[PDB]
PDB file of C-alpha atoms and ligand atoms in Angstrom:
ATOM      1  CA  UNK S  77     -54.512  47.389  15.284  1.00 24.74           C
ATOM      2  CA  UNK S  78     -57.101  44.535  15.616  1.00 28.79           C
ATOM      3  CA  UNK S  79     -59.016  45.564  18.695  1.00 29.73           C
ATOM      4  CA  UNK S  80     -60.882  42.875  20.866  1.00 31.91           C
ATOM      5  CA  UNK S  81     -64.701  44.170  19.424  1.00 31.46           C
ATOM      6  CA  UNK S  82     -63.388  43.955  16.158  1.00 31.02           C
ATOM      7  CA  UNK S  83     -61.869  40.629  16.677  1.00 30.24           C
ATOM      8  CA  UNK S  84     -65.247  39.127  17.966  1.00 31.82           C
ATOM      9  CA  UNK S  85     -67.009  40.511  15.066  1.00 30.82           C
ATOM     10  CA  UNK S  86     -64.789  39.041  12.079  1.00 30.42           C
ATOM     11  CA  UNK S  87     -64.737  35.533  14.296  1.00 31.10           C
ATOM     12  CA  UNK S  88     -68.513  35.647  15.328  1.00 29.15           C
ATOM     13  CA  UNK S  89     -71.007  38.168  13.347  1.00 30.52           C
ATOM     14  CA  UNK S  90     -72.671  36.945  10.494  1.00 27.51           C
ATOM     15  CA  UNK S  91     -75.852  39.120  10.364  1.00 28.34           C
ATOM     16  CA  UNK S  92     -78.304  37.431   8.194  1.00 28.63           C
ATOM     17  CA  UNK S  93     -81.353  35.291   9.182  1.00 29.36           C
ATOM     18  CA  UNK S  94     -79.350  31.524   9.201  1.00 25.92           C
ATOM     19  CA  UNK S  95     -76.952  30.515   7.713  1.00 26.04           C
ATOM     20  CA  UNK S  96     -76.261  31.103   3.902  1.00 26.09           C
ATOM     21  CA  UNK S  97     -73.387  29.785   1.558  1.00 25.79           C
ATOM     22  CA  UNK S  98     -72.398  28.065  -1.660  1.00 23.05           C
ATOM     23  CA  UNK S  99     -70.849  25.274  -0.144  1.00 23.45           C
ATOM     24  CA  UNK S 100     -70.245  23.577   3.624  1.00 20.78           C
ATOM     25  CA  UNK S 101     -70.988  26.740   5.563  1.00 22.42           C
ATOM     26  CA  UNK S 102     -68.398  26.373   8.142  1.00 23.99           C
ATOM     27  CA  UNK S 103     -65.451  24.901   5.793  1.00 25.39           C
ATOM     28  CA  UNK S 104     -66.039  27.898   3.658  1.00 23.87           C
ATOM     29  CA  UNK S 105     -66.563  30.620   6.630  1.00 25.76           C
ATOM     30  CA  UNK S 106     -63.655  29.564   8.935  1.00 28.12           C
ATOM     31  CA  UNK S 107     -61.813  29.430   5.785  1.00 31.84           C
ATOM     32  CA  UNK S 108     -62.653  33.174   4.597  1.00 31.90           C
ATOM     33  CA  UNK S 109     -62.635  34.661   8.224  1.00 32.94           C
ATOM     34  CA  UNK S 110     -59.204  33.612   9.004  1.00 29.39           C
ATOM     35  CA  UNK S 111     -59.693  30.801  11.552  1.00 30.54           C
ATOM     36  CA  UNK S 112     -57.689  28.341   9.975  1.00 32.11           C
ATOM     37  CA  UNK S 113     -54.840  30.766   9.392  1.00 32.36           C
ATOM     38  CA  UNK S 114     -52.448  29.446  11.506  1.00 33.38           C
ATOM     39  CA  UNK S 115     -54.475  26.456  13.372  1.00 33.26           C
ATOM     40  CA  UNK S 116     -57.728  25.132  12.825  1.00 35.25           C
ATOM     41  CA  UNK S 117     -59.971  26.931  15.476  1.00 34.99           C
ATOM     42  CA  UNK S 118     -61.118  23.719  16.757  1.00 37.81           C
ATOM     43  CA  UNK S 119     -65.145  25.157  17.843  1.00 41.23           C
ATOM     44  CA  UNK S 120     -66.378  27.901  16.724  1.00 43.34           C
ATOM     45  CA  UNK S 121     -69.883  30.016  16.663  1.00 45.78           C
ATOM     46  CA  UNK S 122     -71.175  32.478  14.247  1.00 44.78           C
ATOM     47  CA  UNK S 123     -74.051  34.658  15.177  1.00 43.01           C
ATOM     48  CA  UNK S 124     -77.287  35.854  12.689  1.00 41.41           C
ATOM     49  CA  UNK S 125     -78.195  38.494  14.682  1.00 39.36           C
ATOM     50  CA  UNK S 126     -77.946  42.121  14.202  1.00 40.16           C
ATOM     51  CA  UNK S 127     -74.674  43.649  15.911  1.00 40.20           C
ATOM     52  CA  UNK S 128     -77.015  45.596  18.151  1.00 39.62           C
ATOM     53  CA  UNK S 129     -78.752  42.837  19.059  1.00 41.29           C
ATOM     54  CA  UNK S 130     -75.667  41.221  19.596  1.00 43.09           C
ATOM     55  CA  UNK S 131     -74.286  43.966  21.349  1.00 45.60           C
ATOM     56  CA  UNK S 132     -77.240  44.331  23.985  1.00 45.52           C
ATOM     57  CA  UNK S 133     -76.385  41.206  25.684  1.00 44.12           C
ATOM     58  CA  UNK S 134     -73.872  43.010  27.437  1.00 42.59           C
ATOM     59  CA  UNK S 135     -76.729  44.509  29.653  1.00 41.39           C
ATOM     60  CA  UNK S 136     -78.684  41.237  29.755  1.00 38.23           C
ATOM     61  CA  UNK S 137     -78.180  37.889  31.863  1.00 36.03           C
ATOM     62  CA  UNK S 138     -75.204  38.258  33.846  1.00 35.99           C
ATOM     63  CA  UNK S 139     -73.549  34.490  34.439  1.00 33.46           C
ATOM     64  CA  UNK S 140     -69.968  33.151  35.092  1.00 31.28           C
ATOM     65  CA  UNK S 141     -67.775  32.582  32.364  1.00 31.98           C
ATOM     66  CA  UNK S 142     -66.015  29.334  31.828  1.00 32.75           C
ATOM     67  CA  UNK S 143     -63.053  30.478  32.923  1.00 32.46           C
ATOM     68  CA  UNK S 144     -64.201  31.589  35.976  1.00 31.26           C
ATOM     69  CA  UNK S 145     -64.286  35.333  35.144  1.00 28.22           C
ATOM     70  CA  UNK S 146     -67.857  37.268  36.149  1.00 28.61           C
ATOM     71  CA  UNK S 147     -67.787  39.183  32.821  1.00 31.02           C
ATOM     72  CA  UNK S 148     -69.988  36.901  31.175  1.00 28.89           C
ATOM     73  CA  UNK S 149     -73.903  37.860  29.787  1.00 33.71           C
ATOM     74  CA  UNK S 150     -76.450  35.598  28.564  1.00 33.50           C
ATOM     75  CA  UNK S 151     -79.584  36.435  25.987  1.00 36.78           C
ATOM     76  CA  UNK S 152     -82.431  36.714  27.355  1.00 36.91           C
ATOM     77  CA  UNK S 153     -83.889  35.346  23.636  1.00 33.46           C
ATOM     78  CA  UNK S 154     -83.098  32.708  21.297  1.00 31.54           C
ATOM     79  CA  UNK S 155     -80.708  33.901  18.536  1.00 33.92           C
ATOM     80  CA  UNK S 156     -79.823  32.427  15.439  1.00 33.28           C
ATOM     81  CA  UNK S 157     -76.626  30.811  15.214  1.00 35.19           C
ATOM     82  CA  UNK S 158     -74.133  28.144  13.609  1.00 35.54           C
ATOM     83  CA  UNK S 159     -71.780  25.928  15.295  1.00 35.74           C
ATOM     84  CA  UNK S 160     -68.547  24.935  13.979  1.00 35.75           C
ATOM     85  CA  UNK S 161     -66.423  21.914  15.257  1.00 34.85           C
ATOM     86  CA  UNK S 162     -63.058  20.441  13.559  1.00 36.48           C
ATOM     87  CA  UNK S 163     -63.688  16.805  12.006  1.00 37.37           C
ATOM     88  CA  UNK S 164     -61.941  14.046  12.795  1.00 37.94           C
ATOM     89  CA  UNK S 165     -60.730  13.724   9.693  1.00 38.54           C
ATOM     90  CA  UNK S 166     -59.475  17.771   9.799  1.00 40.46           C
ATOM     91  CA  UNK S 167     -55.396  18.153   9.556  1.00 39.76           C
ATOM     92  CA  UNK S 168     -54.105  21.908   9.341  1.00 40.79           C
ATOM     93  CA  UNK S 169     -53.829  23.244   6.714  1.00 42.73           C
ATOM     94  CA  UNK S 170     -56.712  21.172   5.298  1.00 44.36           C
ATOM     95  CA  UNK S 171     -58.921  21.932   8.495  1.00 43.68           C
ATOM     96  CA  UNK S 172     -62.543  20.566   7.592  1.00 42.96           C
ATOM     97  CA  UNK S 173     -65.489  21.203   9.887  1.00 39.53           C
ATOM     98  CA  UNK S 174     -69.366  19.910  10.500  1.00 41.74           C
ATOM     99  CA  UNK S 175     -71.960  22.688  10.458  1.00 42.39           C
ATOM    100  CA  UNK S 176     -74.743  22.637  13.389  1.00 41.58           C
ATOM    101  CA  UNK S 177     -77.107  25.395  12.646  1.00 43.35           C
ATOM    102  CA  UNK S 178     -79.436  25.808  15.866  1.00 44.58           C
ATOM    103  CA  UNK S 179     -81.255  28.673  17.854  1.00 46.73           C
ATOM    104  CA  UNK S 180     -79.688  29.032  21.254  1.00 46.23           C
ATOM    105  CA  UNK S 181     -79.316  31.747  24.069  1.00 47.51           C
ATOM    106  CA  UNK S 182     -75.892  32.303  23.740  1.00 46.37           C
ATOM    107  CA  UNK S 183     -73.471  33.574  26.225  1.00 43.64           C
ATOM    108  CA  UNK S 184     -70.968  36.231  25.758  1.00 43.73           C
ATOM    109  CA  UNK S 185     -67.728  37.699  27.454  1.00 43.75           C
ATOM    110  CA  UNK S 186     -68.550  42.053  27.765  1.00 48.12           C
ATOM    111  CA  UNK S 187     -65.234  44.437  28.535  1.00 46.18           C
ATOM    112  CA  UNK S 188     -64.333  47.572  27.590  1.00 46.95           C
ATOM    113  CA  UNK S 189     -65.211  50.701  27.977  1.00 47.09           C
ATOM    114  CA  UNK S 190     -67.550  50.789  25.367  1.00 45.62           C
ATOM    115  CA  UNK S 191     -68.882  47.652  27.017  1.00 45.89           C
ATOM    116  CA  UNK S 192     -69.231  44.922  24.124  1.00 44.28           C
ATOM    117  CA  UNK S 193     -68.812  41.261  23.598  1.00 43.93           C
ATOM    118  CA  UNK S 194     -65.067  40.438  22.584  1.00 43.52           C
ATOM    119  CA  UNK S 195     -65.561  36.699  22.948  1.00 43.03           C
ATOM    120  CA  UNK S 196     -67.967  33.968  22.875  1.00 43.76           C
ATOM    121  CA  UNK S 197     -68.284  31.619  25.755  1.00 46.64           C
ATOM    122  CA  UNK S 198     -70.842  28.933  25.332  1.00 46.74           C
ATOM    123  CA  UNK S 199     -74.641  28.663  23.566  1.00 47.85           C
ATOM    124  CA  UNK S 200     -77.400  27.286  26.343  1.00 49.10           C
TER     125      UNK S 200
HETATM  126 AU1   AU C 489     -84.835  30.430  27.307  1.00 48.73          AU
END
């Protein structure tokens, strides 16, 4: 039932201008978005963007992915992001993370038919 947009948008969208929370931004949002369900997602990157925004890099920068796959786009702007990486000191279940907010071009994987991001490749 999950589909692959869907998936990208509970692991990456966080429309708002940074980053916002009560406590350590990524121990809290991994936490609530179910990345440390069943591992700790080791890196991860949330985007404060508008989905559209978001969504329009699909027709921007075409680049390789990282896997070697042509199906990758990059911004043509900045955008607002945070980036999550497991501590050390992280163990599943008790996965801990440092926050890295920064302004980046990031670089998306597009498929589908609507063509939309359904996974997020690097930040440049
Ligand atoms: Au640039």
């Amino acid at each position: 039932k999950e589909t692959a947009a869907a998936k990208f948008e509970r692991q990456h969208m966080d429309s708002s201008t940074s980053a916002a929370s009560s406590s350590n931004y990524c121990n809290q949002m991994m936490k609530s978005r179910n990345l440390t369900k069943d591992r700790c997602k080791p890196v991860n990157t949330f985007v404060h963007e508008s989905l559209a925004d978001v969504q329009a890099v699909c027709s921007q920068k075409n680049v390789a992915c990282k896997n070697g796959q042509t199906n990758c786009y990059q911004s043509y702007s900045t955008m607002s992001i945070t980036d999550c990486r497991e501590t050390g000191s992280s163990k599943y279940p008790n996965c801990a993370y440092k926050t890295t907010q920064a302004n980046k071009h990031i670089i998306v994987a597009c498929e589908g038919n609507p063509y939309v991001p359904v996974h997020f490749d690097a930040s440049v």
